[PDB]
Amino acid sequence: CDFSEEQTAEFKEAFQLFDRTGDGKILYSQCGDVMRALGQNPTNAEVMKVLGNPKSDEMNLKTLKFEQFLPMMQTIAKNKDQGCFEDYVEGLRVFDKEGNGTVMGAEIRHVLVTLGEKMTEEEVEQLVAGHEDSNGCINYEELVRMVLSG
Amino acid sequence: SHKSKKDQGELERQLLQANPILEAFGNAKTVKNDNSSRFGKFIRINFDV
Ligand SMILES: [Mg+2]
């Protein structure tokens, strides 16, 4: 196996925690959610691509076993791609007007809402460490290090 | 729009008025154009860093 089953034994307990019947079973909508909560951070593309199918509107219908999600987790882990801290930091410097990593939070908000995986405003409102004073700055590097954990 | 704490400011309100005033004075109906300039103008808009 690609991961220690002595800790997948803990993962089966973790799979039990969220709101469901249990019974050894998760829904495809939950497969991605658990992969976020426990696995390495997936894109929506990876959820649809790996051991699954992109034609998955009403993703609460399809259902997979804990011992099917664990193959999904392992197959993602051995095929995922990952950027380093410097890649995302430079991805912020590409916007940096100040050369010091202190652009106002409205820029980060606009980018996270507008591009890519289309995050909601309330999700960034959970993420944000700054405040809406007359300065409005969000520091790039330490707040990236605080987000990029696990 | 990018003045996330000072948007819709008053200077950007005045800029849109400066043209109608100088057009009310100045411009005229000639044969070729009903809002003929009758003067040349060069606007400079100044920006910060
Ligand atoms: Mg003219």
Contact B29, B35 (CB under 8 A): yes
Tokens of A110: 């606009």
Residue of B nearest to A97 (CA): B49
Output b/e per residue, A106-123; b: 16+ Cβ within 10 A: ebbbebbeeeeeeeeeee
How many whole angstroms from B15 Cα to the centroid of ligand 1? 18
Residues of A in contact with B4 (CB under 8 A): 104, 106, 136
- The SS3 call for residue A66 is helix
Residue of B nearest to A107 (CA): B2
Residues of B in contact with A106 (CB under 8 A): 4
Interface mutation vs chain A, best among B3, B5, B6, B48, most A CBs within 10 Å:
B5
Strand (E) positions, A8-65?
25-27, 63-65
Q: Of A73, A72, A14, give the one whose Cα is nearest residue A40.
A: A73
How many whole angstroms from B45 Cα to the centroid of ligand 1? 20
Q: Of A23, A32, A24, give the one whose Cα is nearest residue A51.
A: A32
Residues of B in contact with A134 (CB under 8 A): 5
Strand partners, A63: A27
Per-state percent for chain B, helix, strand, coil, to nearest 5: 30, 5, 65
CA A70 to chain centre: 17
Residue of B nearest to A133 (CA): B5
Tokens of A29: 């909508």
Q: Of A145, A42, A127, give the one whose Cα is nearest residue A84.
A: A145
- The SS3 call for residue A137 is strand
Contact A96, A88 (CB under 8 A): no
Tokens of B32: 């070729």
Q: Experimental technique used?
A: cryo-EM
Tokens of A51: 């051991």
Give the resolution in Å. 3.0
Contact A75, A50 (CB under 8 A): yes
CB contact under 8 A, B4 and A104: yes
